[PDB]
Design a protein around this ligand. Structure first.
Ligand code: LHY
Ligand code: LHY
Ligand code: ZN
Ligand code: ZN
Lengths: 158, 159
């Protein structure tokens, strides 16, 4: 097992548009290990999500993993989901405000997000999934996709 | 073994300074798998070297692997060397000029002046320190790959 260094605000890797994962990488040891290192890194830093660019990997892979922990004591439980090449298909016009932080901005803020999102993605095995999130998990999906598109949560404030 | 997508000139991932590999990564299955995918990619594309930023991984890992192949039919053959956190500690004042291509630059080769000899200190995948002297075409490969780690493409070194 490994815990990967996390890039911080100011580093240009967080400003890129991450590249999609290729068909060759689906169901590979390489991809399972990337996802495992990400997962371990998120857990060690009490994150509730992580995106590959945060660990210097400019690829479209995120994890969404709400759980109560010291950084988010009230966060709801979910089974962690690894999403390859996620795309938000629909954002609700209805919005919610919530406090976010970021492993890459060690500073928190209050951000407006869609209350609901519908997201398409591939599993690590290559299966195409479409699914709806609400509330805090929806916020995490939006924050992590933003990371894939070179956007930090501070740029969504004001 | 997986063959990975390769970034091309224009893509901003190739302009960054790649981050050093951290101590906890040394001798990790993570780092072994990265190197294996790099190596497979390089062989599948007939490269004689590869840098992690070329496969969208902004970390300081390179492979130097001169061998004759369809892209470089007269290259000398060496045993492939994977280098973690390579640092060039000496460049010779003597220069050689040679035609270089790049996995990241399609449809172009150019004449590039390189030091004829470089001394490079690096870590193995297990994390052991090694210092090696390279000459000639292997030396040009080391220099090209270290330039990839520093956000530089060979086109920026011409004339
Ligand atoms: O930086 C990351 N993700 O990029 N981790 C965030 C995820 C997050 C997203 C939205 C709201 C709250 C929290 C964190 O502080 O755990
Ligand atoms: O683009 C890469 N490496 O980044 N590979 C180059 C390596 C290289 C370096 C120097 C001289 C000739 C060839 C290639 O065309 O195989
Ligand atoms: Zn974040
Ligand atoms: Zn190159």
């Amino acid at each position: 097992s490994v815990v990967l260094p996390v890039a911080k605000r100011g580093e240009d890797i967080l400003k890129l548009i991450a590249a999609p994962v290729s068909a060759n990488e689906l169901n590979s040891n390489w991809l399972y290990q990337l996802a495992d290192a990400m997962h371990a890194t998120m857990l060690e830093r009490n994150g509730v999500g992580i995106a590959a660019p945060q660990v210097y990997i400019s690829k479209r892979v995120i994890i969404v993993a709400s759980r109560p922990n010291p950084r988010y004591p009230d966060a709801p439980e979910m089974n962690a989901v690894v999403m390859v090449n996620p795309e938000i298909l629909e954002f609700s016009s209805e919005m919610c405000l919530g406090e976010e932080g970021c492993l890459s901005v060690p500073e928190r803020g209050q951000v407006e997000r869609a209350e609901m999102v519908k997201v398409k993605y591939l599993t690590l095995q290559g299966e195409m999934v479409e699914t709806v999130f609400q509330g805090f998990p929806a916020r995490i999906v939006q924050h992590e996709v933003d990371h894939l598109n070179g956007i930090l949560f501070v740029e969504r404030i004001s």
